[PDB]
Design a protein around this ligand. Structure first.
Ligand SMILES: CC[C@@H](C)n1ncn(-c2ccc(N3CCN(c4ccc(OC[C@H]5CO[C@](Cn6cncn6)(c6ccc(Cl)cc6Cl)O5)cc4)CC3)cc2)c1=O
Ligand code: HEM
Length: 529
């Protein structure tokens, strides 16, 4: 009646194991985690208190490759097999996806104690922006930082930004190799080259001021390029690794934040603090509610973050607008007529107020943001176990929740013929967004309380975007001028490119070229160059 001899043969087996040929021991260190992985998923599939988990062959990697290459195609397959809630493994992490408007509610209105955005995002952005701001600080600091920035983003600021943004667009048509409208009447451009330059020029001039704008004409512009490089999904797994890419980024962040602090300390020294730009504004208005002031280093890091966020979402969006309009001369024609009616055939300077009298222009932005949400996946790390309403599912702490309003933007159920670009689906509804009812303030102004809208380009809840009006202002001036100045179309046989879902924003797969030509070949842009 001896089990003792079994326990001996366990120990013997462990010892015979350790003495295997190194060819078999490498094999086992591969085959036994592979076998265990399959065994674990099958067992996992039994738990009725967990959403279904998408099956995967490679441990740790998970569904990373198919999710990254074509996330909306991934989501649609999963939705057919499992419905709206399902999980998948992604480079070590378990992501729980909740598709559709209830998904929006579940994640964007999640209680602050249940989930954390900074725990999800901190590695992605802190290396790039610097310490102390955005996701490298507690939520209540973030709430107030959004309040400070929003304070420079008022109707009266937009009124003064508009002629500044217009000036930069015109100087870019005049001076850029891509255009030179005083010398050339037609030409070819890559919109992934032109739009990121146009966006940084206009955002700099209006948010940072003319000094910082002036510096973009120098070799300082190269540091922006270097810091721009460090803004990549790979920071999610490799935020820091001793290589040259990471070294230029860190240098750039120091060099750029140094330049902003130089200006800040310069302005405080001369008492030269007005209401020109966002720098003036944060100098006057960056004291937290427990009395602590933001440092000059933190103020500068915040400027980098604001500028970098606006840079990528807006540049991609104007690239998409150009690309969709290039095959739709009917829409270009209709926008041109609205410009002629609102601006008296051009005998009226563009103002922020007149921009609000251009519904078709704003509907074009709205519709581009529907087809091309710059951020396909928004994340939160789960901090406490969460019950999913009307289900038996519990999402345990340590999981991530993923919400994807850009996926819902492309469903026929909520947008008839969702794959078709149509600015007229927004007729009599051209506002960037609006709360369908009740509102709430998390620290940075009253916003919509419900987040169930199928259309959520700026998200919702406490992490809701605050740059929506600035983006529309910027994109509006830009497109108003393109339309009044140029017609454009595709090279023969070219059409809208598919999105690049592996970058930070869903920008077009390039080279994405359009051919432009002047509406008025003899028109000249004045000023010195
Ligand atoms: C390894 C194999 C390969 C095939 N693969 N396998 C998987 N993937 C992959 C997966 C996921 C993703 N991403 C794309 C980027 N994405 C993402 C990027 C930025 C982001 O930002 C959310 C927060 C933080 O940044 C901002 C962005 N922003 C918002 N408005 C303007 N910018 C932000 C907020 C505030 C401020 Cl001040 C700045 C910034 Cl940047 O909001 C959220 C998600 C996550 C998924 C990419 C590739 C791959 O490429
Ligand atoms: C087309 C332009 C833009 C789009 C579509 C967009 C979209 C978004 C979205 C979806 C979020 C929420 C992210 C999340 O919930 O995880 C967000 C957050 C945010 N965005 Fe934007 N954005 C745009 C432009 C801008 C601009 C121009 C600025 C700055 C002026 C800006 C600043 C911010 C800030 C400060 C947050 C808050 C992040 C947080 O609270 O955690 N965005 N944006």
């Amino acid at each position: 009646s001896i089990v003792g001899e079994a326990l001996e043969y366990v120990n013997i087996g462990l010892s015979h194991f350790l003495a295997l040929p190194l060819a078999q021991r490498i094999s086992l260190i591969i085959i036994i985690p592979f076998i265990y992985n399959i065994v674990w998923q099958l067992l996992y599939s039994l738990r009725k208190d967990r959403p279904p988990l998408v099956f995967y062959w490679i441990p740790w990697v998970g569904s990373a490759v198919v999710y990254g290459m074509k996330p909306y195609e991934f989501f649609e397959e999963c939705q057919k097999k499992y419905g709206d809630i399902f999980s998948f493994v992604l480079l070590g992490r378990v992501m729980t996806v909740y598709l559709g408007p209830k998904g929006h509610e579940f994640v964007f209105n999640a209680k602050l104690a249940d989930v954390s955005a900074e725990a999800a995002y901190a590695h992605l952005t802190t290396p790039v922006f610097g310490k102390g701001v955005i996701h490298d600080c507690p939520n209540s600091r973030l709430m107030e930082q959004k309040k400070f920035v929003k304070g420079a983003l008022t109707k009266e600021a937009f009124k003064s930004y508009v002629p500044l943004i217009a000036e930069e667009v015109y100087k870019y048509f005049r001076d850029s190799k891509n255009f030179r409208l005083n010398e050339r009447t037609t030409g070819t451009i890559d919109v992934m080259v032109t739009q990121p330059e146009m966006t940084i020029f206009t955002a700099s001039r209006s948010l940072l001021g003319k000094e910082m704008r002036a510096k973009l004409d120098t070799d300082f512009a190269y540091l922006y390029s270097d810091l721009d490089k460090g803004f990549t999904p790979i920071n999610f797994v490799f935020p820091n690794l001793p290589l040259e890419h990471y070294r230029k980024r860190d240098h750039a962040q120091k060099a750029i934040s140094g330049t902003y602090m130089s200006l800040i300390k310069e302005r405080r020294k001369n008492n030269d603090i007005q209401d020109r730009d966002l720098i003036d504004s944060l100098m006057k208005n960056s004291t937290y509610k427990d009395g602590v002031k933001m440092t000059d280093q933190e103020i500068a890091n915040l400027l980098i973050g604001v500028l970098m966020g606006g840079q990528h979402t807006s540049a991609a969006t104007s690239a998409w607008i150009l690309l969709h309009l290039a095959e739709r001369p009917d829409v270009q024609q209709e926008l041109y007529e609205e410009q002629m009616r609102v601006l008296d055939g051009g005998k009226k300077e563009l103002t922020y107020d007149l921009l609000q009298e251009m519904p078709l222009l704003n509907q074009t932005i709205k519709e581009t943001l529907r087809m091309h949400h710059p951020l396909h996946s928004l994340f939160r790390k789960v901090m406490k176990d969460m019950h999913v309403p009307n289900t038996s599912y519990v999402i345990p702490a340590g999981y991530h929740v993923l919400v994807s309003p850009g996926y819902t933007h492309l469903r026929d159920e909520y947008f008839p013929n969702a794959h078709q670009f149509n600015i007229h689906r927004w007729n009599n509804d051209s506002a960037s967004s609006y709360s369908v009812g009740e509102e709430v303030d998390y620290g940075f102004g009253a916003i919509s309380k419900g987040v169930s809208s199928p259309y959520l380009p700026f998200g919702g809840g406490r992490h809701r975007c605050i740059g929506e009006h600035f983006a529309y202002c910027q994109l509006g001036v830009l497109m108003s001028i393109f339309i009044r100045t140029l017609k454009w179309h595709y090279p023969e046989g070219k059409t809208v490119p598919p999105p690049d879902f592996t970058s930070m924003v869903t920008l077009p797969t390039g080279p994405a070229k359009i051919i432009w030509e002047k509406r008025n070949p003899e028109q000249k842009i004045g000023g010195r160059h």
